Structures are given as C-alpha cells and as structure tokens.
Write an enzyme that holds these catalytic residues in place. Structure first.
Site, PDB file in Angstrom:
ATOM      1  N   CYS A 219     -10.102   6.205 -87.027  1.00  0.00           N
ATOM      2  CA  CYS A 219      -9.378   7.237 -86.294  1.00  0.00           C
ATOM      3  C   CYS A 219      -7.927   6.822 -86.127  1.00  0.00           C
ATOM      4  CB  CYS A 219     -10.048   7.540 -84.956  1.00  0.00           C
ATOM      5  SG  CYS A 219     -10.267   6.098 -83.900  1.00  0.00           S
ATOM      6  N   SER A 220      -7.505   6.596 -84.886  1.00  0.00           N
ATOM      7  CA  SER A 220      -6.173   6.059 -84.607  1.00  0.00           C
ATOM      8  C   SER A 220      -6.226   4.561 -84.301  1.00  0.00           C
ATOM      9  CB  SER A 220      -5.504   6.831 -83.461  1.00  0.00           C
ATOM     10  OG  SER A 220      -6.370   6.960 -82.339  1.00  0.00           O
ATOM     11  N   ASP A 221      -6.880   4.202 -83.200  1.00  0.00           N
ATOM     12  CA  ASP A 221      -7.067   2.802 -82.809  1.00  0.00           C
ATOM     13  C   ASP A 221      -8.280   2.112 -83.456  1.00  0.00           C
ATOM     14  OD1 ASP A 221      -9.203   3.866 -81.151  1.00  0.00           O
ATOM     15  OD2 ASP A 221      -7.855   4.009 -79.451  1.00  0.00           O
ATOM     16  N   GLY A 222      -9.079   2.886 -84.191  1.00  0.00           N
ATOM     17  CA  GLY A 222     -10.352   2.415 -84.737  1.00  0.00           C
ATOM     18  C   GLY A 222     -11.353   1.940 -83.695  1.00  0.00           C
ATOM     19  N   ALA A 223     -11.314   2.553 -82.516  1.00  0.00           N
ATOM     20  CA  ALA A 223     -12.165   2.151 -81.402  1.00  0.00           C
ATOM     21  C   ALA A 223     -12.799   3.329 -80.651  1.00  0.00           C
ATOM     22  CB  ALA A 223     -11.405   1.244 -80.448  1.00  0.00           C
ATOM     23  N   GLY A 224     -11.995   4.335 -80.322  1.00  0.00           N
ATOM     24  CA  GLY A 224     -12.451   5.419 -79.447  1.00  0.00           C
ATOM     25  C   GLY A 224     -13.382   6.405 -80.123  1.00  0.00           C
ATOM     26  N   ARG A 225     -12.798   7.248 -80.969  1.00  0.00           N
ATOM     27  CA  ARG A 225     -13.560   8.171 -81.785  1.00  0.00           C
ATOM     28  C   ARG A 225     -14.382   7.442 -82.860  1.00  0.00           C
ATOM     29  NH1 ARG A 225      -8.285  12.001 -82.574  1.00  0.00           N
ATOM     30  NH2 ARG A 225      -7.349   9.918 -82.415  1.00  0.00           N
TER      31      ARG A 225
END
Length: 287
Positions: A219-225
């Site tokens: 995703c963006s941070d590779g953590a949330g989504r």
C-alpha cells in the site's frame, strides 16, 4: 461446519468489549526479536517511506548486491510465511518511492513473483501514497527490467487489473505478471462494504501465482492496508484447508512476528473480521 464458525464470528463482531480488549492487547504486543537496526541505518533512511514502518532484521528481503545498481541489499520489504511451505507466502512492502523503483523490480525479478497487489491510489486527497512504478502505456525500462503494459481491464470503480510482460534485458528472460490495483481503500477508516475487496481477492487468488512464489502486497507504508489484506487472506486460506487455528487476533500476532505494526487501526481489525465472515457467509449461500 461453516455455519458453526460463521455463528462464532458474528457473535465476535457484535461483542464490542471483546473487540476493544483484543485490540488493547494487540497494541501492547511485541515480537521477539523486534530490532529494525539495518533499516534504520544511515544509508537506508532515504529508502523508507515511513520511519515507523520498517522490516525486522530477522525478516527482510535482501536484494542480490551484485545485481543492485547501488550495490546495496536493502529494500523495505518483509517475507510473510506460514511454517508449512505448501501454504501461500507474501512479501509485504511499502509503496515504492521514486528512487526505490528499480529496487522494487529487482525484488519482483529475484523473488519469482507473478502477482502484485496494490492497495492504494497514487494520491489520496492531495497526499501522495505511492510513486508510479509501471508504464501508463507501452514500455518502461527500470535498470535491466523492461516492463510492458499489455492489458488494462477496469472491472469496476473499486478495482482494475494490469497485465504486464516483464523482460530482463540482460539475460533476455521473460515473465508475465499481473498487477491487481484496488482503488477505493482509504488509509484512514475502512471501506463501507467488504464485498468489492472480497471479489477483488477472488480474482487475485485465481491468477497464476508462479511455482511456489510470493504474492507481493503493498500500500503506502506496507503496514495498514497491506496487513489488513494479508490478515483476511491468511484467515480465509487456513479455514479452506480446514486448519484448527481459528483465531484472528492470534493470527495477527503471527503476522506481527514477521513485520511490525501490521493492521494499524481497530477499524481495520474489525473490518478484517467482517470480511472473513462475509466470505464464509457468501460461500454457504452459494451452497
């Protein structure tokens, strides 16, 4: 029975005090080990999108130094396994930065990956989430990796699919790759339905995955989504094999043993459980 397991999850979902207590316990969860020292090192800080969202030293993707343009091994990417190798593996990674686009493709190449799951739009109300790492049309060359846009199929407003022809121009080896791009998932708060994501997931999983190769999820941070997607997929895949470990919070613990901070909010946690229960429901209504 799915009727028994579905009855359990629906009770779990209605139980908001149980939800609040699980999440509280998860906010205090710490893996052992948990050191991210290599990622935090001076050469590597510019290669991370978000300082709080990094790979563990014990669980990071290492690029082949000789094949790297900068002669470094570092990418913000984590392998996510089960103990069984016959089970589906992932690479959880950040959305590539402009200067890590060639690193990303070297990771795609050396991993064997034929499937990419992208879970963010490039920009979310004026905030850039990810840099574009693929050609809009025709071909683009990133170091020695020629990426050719063969096909783009917009299925709905929620998601589309890009098919790519990838050439290592050095060795002249070729590979087909499919990028699944989910467009409608906000970084804060959740989608109002789990439906479109679950339909998207069915298309991801029916795709040719390679010979024991990871799906790349970002995703963006590779953590949330990224984490929320991997949690839903992991729980559902385990259920399908008739695995006895049916506990979503403990499954999240197993994911956080491998990459820190995955599933960022209580909303994303509760969405994951709703999505798992909607899919089980869906399967039964079709029987």
């Amino acid at each position: 029975t799915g009727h028994m397991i579905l009855a359990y999850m629906e009770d779990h979902l209605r139980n908001r005090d149980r939800l609040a207590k699980e999440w509280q316990a998860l906010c205090a969860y710490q893996a052992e080990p948990n050191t991210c020292a290599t990622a935090q090192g001076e050469g590597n800080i510019k290669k991370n999108r978000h300082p709080d969202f990094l790979p563990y030293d014990h669980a990071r993707i290492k690029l082949k130094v000789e094949s790297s343009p900068s002669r470094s091994d570092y990418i913000n990417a984590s392998p996510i396994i089960e103990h069984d190798p016959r089970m589906p593996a992932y690479i959880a990674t950040q959305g590539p930065l402009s200067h890590t686009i060639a690193d990303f493709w070297q990771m795609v190449w050396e991993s064997g990956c034929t499937v990419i799951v992208m879970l963010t739009p490039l920009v979310e109300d004026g905030v850039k989430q990810c840099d574009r790492y693929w050609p809009d049309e025709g071909a683009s060359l990133y170091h020695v990796y020629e990426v050719n846009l063969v096909s783009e199929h917009i299925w709905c407003e929620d998601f589309l699919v890009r098919s790519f022809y990838l050439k290592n121009v050095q060795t002249q080896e070729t590979r087909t790759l499919t990028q699944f791009h989910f467009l409608s998932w906000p970084a804060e708060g959740t989608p109002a339905s789990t439906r479109p994501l679950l339909d998207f997931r069915r298309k991801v999983n029916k795709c040719y995955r390679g010979r024991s190769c990871p799906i790349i999820v970002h995703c963006s941070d590779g953590a949330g989504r990224t984490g929320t997607y991997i949690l839903i997929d992991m729980v559902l895949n385990r259920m399908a094999k008739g695995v006895k470990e049916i506990d979503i919070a403990a499954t999240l613990e197993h994911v956080r043993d491998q990459r820190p901070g995955l599933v960022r909010s209580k909303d994303q946690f509760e969405f994951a459980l709703t999505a798992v229960a909607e899919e089980v429901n869906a399967i039964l209504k079709a029987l």
